[model samples]
Target: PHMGTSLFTDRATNQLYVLLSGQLHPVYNLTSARLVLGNPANPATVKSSELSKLPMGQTVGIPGAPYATPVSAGSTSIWTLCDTVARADSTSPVVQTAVIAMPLEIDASIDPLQSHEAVLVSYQGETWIVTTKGRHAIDLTDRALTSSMGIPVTARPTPISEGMFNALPDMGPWQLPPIPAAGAPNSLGLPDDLVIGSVFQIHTDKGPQYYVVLPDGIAQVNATTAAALRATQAHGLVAPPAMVPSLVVRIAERVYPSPLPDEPLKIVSRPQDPALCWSWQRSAGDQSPQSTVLSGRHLPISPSAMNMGIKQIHGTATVYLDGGKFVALQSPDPRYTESMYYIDPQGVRYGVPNAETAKSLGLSSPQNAPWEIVRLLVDGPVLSKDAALLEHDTLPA
Candidate 1:
């Protein structure tokens, strides 16, 4: 496959409109000397998405021209387009970076074609499965991915190898048990999924740990918002029906045999992880661009009940998991990055592209905003047994 084309997309319209003219591009290896391979031609393909209200087989049209220099993200990993950015007067184009842990170690005996049967994608110290059934072109540069969807992008020698391609079962989306809906007025302040006896990771004068609460109404949280009564604030306009939820987190040692009427957990205002912090990427339509997978950290606020109260300050934000690779029109296509939030205005967020402005920014549209949400189930504790096994392991072994 002597495929050669620029990656990335244009950011004028909201998202990528399939192109009929122009060659499809290649996905660039930004970690390298911007080494990319693939075609810039529209190879004629079919793609699908939950946000696409257009009927199947509708040819939207191709997008802007390609970029000469590929987008760079250091030696660690490549970047992908998570949302679609509409043309903004003064906004710095951003690419959601995904840290590629390592590639599969292929055996020399395996044929390149056969070797592609299955492959492993490493991220955050875990591996995943990929296929080449309908491989299409992957541009690694800042050319909008204007080609058709539903096509496989396998034009170049992927950094991954043949032997490391092991087939694994799909683990599916991370889902928490549905919190029984609260009734009427309570639902207004609190989310429908809010539950009594729920716990949350709280920050106290001592340190960070877990706390329990029986919320009365809606609460608000943020990076700097002080730990105070979680009261209802003005609602942002254009929010969908997906009501967010809260959590119930308690570390092993923090629980008291009897409820402490005097002391309780404080929901502090801060980012999700200690090492991971969030920067406002871009605001398109109405939502903000999130770079990683996030567990919606804050939802409802409540006053103390059942002996839960504390006098301290803390904050919280969601931690989005870096799920998997994404498809777009930038070099090093399929830039292996995951989104923390959805970008699509209609449904959940997806990292689509600002197809119009991709040129001036020297990147692709999908790399821009207008990103779509892959799976935005509100962040909560994993109810899975496998996740729970570690708690069991902590027992003594």
Candidate 2:
């Protein structure tokens, strides 16, 4: 295939340029020695001599060859990954040396799953799964999402609110997959964090523009824009943390809207463990989250879990809004196999069930045990007061 045009063809001075989407590292030096750009797909071992070339946009090794200050190459105009050294003791003479690379742009479009990750191979186009630290990528190229144990990737707009794609065992209204009781190892627990899914909405103004649950009890937000970010009104949502390991998650299906008549905005940020609230605010210096999405394994549907028999066209959900509700519809599926969710203005996730799903599961009503109703709140449960929500016709108000 034609590799198209060069993203960095602007023959600049002695400066070395690194592009994403490839693994070739270029070396640059002060002495007329230009950086030697390497081919991303097929990179050669770097030598000292390659670093001395002029117009160092394309060349392999030299000036110093393998050891010539490595500069990653890619077309990541929005972000750049550079290597760094982490030393334990200053006098220890650097006991261990490891090359680390990460994206370094402040724009929101170049969002990584969690943080500290660099963009790797590009898949279809805009959507690129990346690693927060090392070399890892989440592959979501299959037929719709599937849950473990053959449970079809049921779409529940009522649970987390429509628009976003949620993978669960049970269908119907937003209901937590029946795990063991709270505090129990297997229990679904209160304030349950949906570990598997993607974000449809983003709060770019003030922040670590996004946030995510770190491992057991931690969560983080993006902070690369702090210096450049001017004071936008601090919305009720929590302020972002500095130097998060991944993209900041603005809203998620935390507390789904209540199905009961009396309990309107039921706050459930993390039903599993409310104590993790403080960990969510912890700064980059304090903690680091584990990798949840970056499952390096390449696949048709490795990142997203989907059912077996039903084959999804592209494997990923269309993910759009229908009548103010979040909808996850498969591509080319004749039967509008679309799921819906509603996110009120306050960011509450409400799951909406389909007529076919309700009938198949033998749900007396959308609320019966079989088809439990649920919602996903956008902002944290703390801000879930009586805020008016966006109304969707698909959902019975």
Off by over 4 Å in 1: 1-63, 66-69, 77-264, 269-397
Worst 10 residues of 2 by lDDT: 273-282
Question: What does candidate 2's lDDT look like per residue over 1-397, in tens digits?
Answer: 3353112222333333333234322322211012211222222233335433324334222221111212223222110111111221223211111101122222232222343322222222322222232222223333221121111222111111111112111123222222123222212221333232111124445522333322232222223212111122122223333432232333232432211122121221111111100000111233332222121111112123212112123322111111122222232245544444322222233333454322221222211110111212231221110111111123110
Among these predictions, the greatest TM-score belongs to 1
lDDT of each: 0.23, 0.22
TM-scores of the models, in the order given? 0.16, 0.15
Model 1 residue 340 CA deviation in Å: 18
Error of 2 at 151 (Å): 39
Candidate 1 lDDT over 153-195, as tens digits, reads: 4321222211111111133311111223322223224344333
Once model 2 is optimally superposed onto the true structure by TM-score, how far is the C-alpha of residue 68 displaced, in angstroms?
65
